[PDB]
From Swiss-Prot, chains A, B:
SUPFAM superfamilies named among the record's database cross-references: Glyceraldehyde-3-phosphate dehydrogenase-like, C-terminal domain, NAD(P)-binding Rossmann-fold domains
Catalytic reactions of this protein: L-aspartate 4-semialdehyde + phosphate + NADP(+) = 4-phospho-L-aspartate + NADPH + H(+)
Keywords on record: Amino-acid biosynthesis, Diaminopimelate biosynthesis, Lysine biosynthesis, Methionine biosynthesis, NADP, Oxidoreductase, Threonine biosynthesis
Keyword Lipid metabolism: no
SMART domains documented for this protein: Semialdhyde_dh (SM00859)
Function (record text): Catalyzes the NADPH-dependent formation of L-aspartate-semialdehyde (L-ASA) by the reductive dephosphorylation of L-aspartyl-4-phosphate.
Lineage start: Bacteria, Pseudomonadati, Pseudomonadota, Gammaproteobacteria, Pasteurellales
NCBIfam families, per database record: asd_gamma, PRK06598.1
Binding-site residues for substrate, renumbered to this chain: Q149, E229, R256
Enzyme Commission number: 1.2.1.11
Name of the featured protein: Aspartate-semialdehyde dehydrogenase
Species the sequence originates in: Haemophilus influenzae (strain ATCC 51907 / DSM 11121 / KW20 / Rd)
Length: 357, 357
């Protein structure tokens, strides 16, 4: 059994990997060694201890990676580096894993000697897991995206912040709400007053999220005007499909909203050739066992295509499918997926299972 | 001074009209008569009392309109009917007002004898007030939309519901949040558990909104797969621009989120000819005194382009402007506007001021 080291396994992403791994009994086929950065198991900074491992899996973060990985690969270490952080995604000797979508690229990469596998951007992975079919048939000319992203993507303190915010917004009008005859306008004045107050907790987001939204995620890239988050759409989607040469356009706006862990995305997809909505649904649905096609019905869309629905599940629903007024080659689609699973922990857990088989 | 009757002035939309009217001292130039449906002022159902009025302004609702308007226009009444409800928007003898955008159509309509003016769909009006410039120069081939709509668009009880929901979601983990060392995963399990519980108030939305989203607004139109809400994009936008003959494509997905009164929209706009982002911003900014162009900077976008920012104000910010990977003719834009003002009460208050001048 291959010897595997785990780093950053106590964090949020790491914690979800552990549980998922335990649920699938992944520890039964490998030799797990756990590291830590504490000075209170081995030290995640002990390059020699890491050198003895066949595989390393980090959920620690980009900083850890940029400091340790180079030193380690320097010693000649021939092992496999599995990372959830973005730090190494674009490198020439690294592949962005999402096996249900790019298994071919991964197999080829293994046979070619690639030793670094990096999980991809939550937004992009959730997108590919949803409309993989389209990309597999080369039916996608481009895709305009608009996202509704969960606080879990920014971090655990960001989730707590969102919750405190909602808490204070209701408490600001708790008595008025119980009164079935109170003024709705006066109530709104109050909640808005609190959202704007000094003591309203916004240190983590840098603005209110609860009862609002933030149409800006990550750093600004002066080059294209995009945000690092928006850029990853074009960049990571193609590298994952193994199409860096003739890249398919993927672009849009990444917006943060008041949800805990599911990212939702509205798509306008330019198909290269006009097909009947009916065929398209099968091409979408048959691609993988997770994507779920939700019929364009109201009660069903309200019960299946929402964060409340998919949170903490591996299901990736896609619905509201239909042709867009711009013509028959234009497709409308809306999807929901859990950020911590297919958007973080799952892909990593999946490439690990493969590496120790 | 022309005699004006007001109906549904005690509702939410009506209440905002009254305050705005009072703030601008609109009652100084007209003779106001107030009606009511109660049997506890005149009766909104007294056709003869209404017949004496020069102008009628209703914020009562489609039902009231479809029952009274016909009977009234039947008596031969030559007055002006001002409605905020959608009931009459498409009729041949009605015009959809948004004077800062379609004053020309309104003037022409007045000179032609049109006596029915209807305020338009909140989403569309907020869109036109934002990117009016583009449409005025005929630089818009089509626009793919994705919205983040406030609860106020569905109603006052829907706002209270959203607030109770946020309230219960925080109260479900209130103690754990105070504990700076508590598990973020356990907390999420709990809040999600409450969101999914039986006693979680979702009667008004028919699903959770707080901590989630609902990608379905209004009724389903079997004809195109759109929702009545999504359809109004193509329909109302063109009628407002007076272009029903050669309609510009406007389509997308209308999604409801946890915000009180501002609708936000992400746009992918196909310009018919490639212009430098710099020129485009002026064309956008100069159109009206409300639209506000927010530079593509982080701190600024977090302080100006959000519901928290524009709620209860007449300002209509538009930002995140830049070219989209699909090519130089593709523009990205994000905007925020108050639903109860430019999306409901303002247009109505504006056509009234004109009618009594």
């Amino acid at each position: 059994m291959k010897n595997v080291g785990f780093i950053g396994w106590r964090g949020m992403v790491g914690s979800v990997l552990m549980d998922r791994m335990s649920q699938e009994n992944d520890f039964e086929n490998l030799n797990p060694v756990f590291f830590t950065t504490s000075q209170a198991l081995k030290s995640a900074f002990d390059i020699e201890e890491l050198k003895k491992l066949d595989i390393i899996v980090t959920c620690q973060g980009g900083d850890y990676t940029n400091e340790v990985y180079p030193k380690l690969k320097a010693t000649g270490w021939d092992g496999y580096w599995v990372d959830a952080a973005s730090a190494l995604r674009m490198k020439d000797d690294a592949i962005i894993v999402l096996d249900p979508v790019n298994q071919h690229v991964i197999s080829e990469g293994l046979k070619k000697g690639i030793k670094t596998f990096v999980g991809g951007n939550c937004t992009v992975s959730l997108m590919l897991m949803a409309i993989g079919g389209l990309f597999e048939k080369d039916l996608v000319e481009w895709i305009s995206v608009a996202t509704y992203q969960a606080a879990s993507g920014a971090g655990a303190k960001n989730m707590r912040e969102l919750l405190s915010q909602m808490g204070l917004l209701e408490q600001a009008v708790s008595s008025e709400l119980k009164d079935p005859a109170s003024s709705i306008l006066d109530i709104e004045r109050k909640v808005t007053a609190k959202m704007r107050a000094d003591n309203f907790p916004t240190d983590n987001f840098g603005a209110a999220l609860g009862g609002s939204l933030i149409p800006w995620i990550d750093k600004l890239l002066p080059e294209t005007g995009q945000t690092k988050e928006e850029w990853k759409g074009y960049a990571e989607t193609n590298k994952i499909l193994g199409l860096s040469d003739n890249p398919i356009p993927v672009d849009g706006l990444c917006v943060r909203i008041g949800a805990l862990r599911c990212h939702s995305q509205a798509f306008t997809i330019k198909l290269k050739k006009d097909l009947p909505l009916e065929e398209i649904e099968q091409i979408i649905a048959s691609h993988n066992e997770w994507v779920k096609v939700i019929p364009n019905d109201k009660e069903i869309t309200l019960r299946e295509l929402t964060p409340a629905k998919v949170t903490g599940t591996l299901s990736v629903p896609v619905g509201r499918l239909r042709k867009l007024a711009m013509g028959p080659e234009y497709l409308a689609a809306f999807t929901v997926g859990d950020q911590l699973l297919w958007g973080a922990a799952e892909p990593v857990r999946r490439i690990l299972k493969q590496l120790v088989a």
